[PDB]
């Protein structure tokens, strides 16, 4: 589980809090954060994914209060539902993967040679057991390995 600041989050379901780079889901045990580039749409369709069983796909109101909460205009409709393992990175790749993980400022250790490691039109998409770096220079941390595929489904995309 990652640390969350009480007074900076605004609730937007009966166990969602959202907050300035990420949100907790204590319903389905799902918490985020991210760092580096703006990875704000991303967080908002993993909630719209999240709640759309329960509300249907007009009005889904915890994104929607997400969306005012951070305000960002994305429609509903918008959000819709691969990919090149590599066999041996270089330490060099490692190492240039690593420095980015610097630039970035991460709140806790990552260590990118844990990671496993993709090819990508854009570049390099590293996916650890508690985090993602992706080639858009966003790097997300999460509480669980398999809410890396909640963000994968939509990093492509803003």
């Known amino acids: 589980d990652l640390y ?4 900076s989050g605004m609730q937007c379901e009966e166990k969602l809090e959202v907050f300035e780079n990420g949100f907790k889901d204590e319903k389905f045990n799902v918490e985020v954060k991210f760092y580096g580039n703006d990875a704000r749409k991303v967080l908002l369709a993993m909630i719209y994914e999240l709640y759309l069983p329960e ?4 009005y889904v109101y915890p994104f929607e209060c997400a969306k005012e909460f951070w305000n960002i205009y994305l429609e509903g409709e918008e959000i819709q539902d691969q990919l090149k393992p590599i066999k041996f990175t270089s330490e060099q ?4 993967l ?3 993980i610097k ?8 260590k990118i040679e844990e990671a496993k490691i993709y090819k990508t039109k854009e570049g390099y998409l590293a996916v650890g057991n508690y985090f993602i770096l992706d080639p858009r220079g966003r790097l997300f941390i999460f509480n669980k390995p398999s809410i890396a595929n909640k963000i994968l489904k939509y990093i492509w995309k803003w």
Request: proline share 9%; hydrophobic share 25%; no cysteine.
């Open 98 to 100: 690593q420095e980015e």
């Open 103 to 110: 630039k970035i400022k991460p709140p806790l250790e990552i």
């Open 55 to 58: 509300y249907g796909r007009e």
């Open 4 to 7: 969350f600041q009480g007074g």
């Open 93 to 96: 790749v490692i190492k240039k």
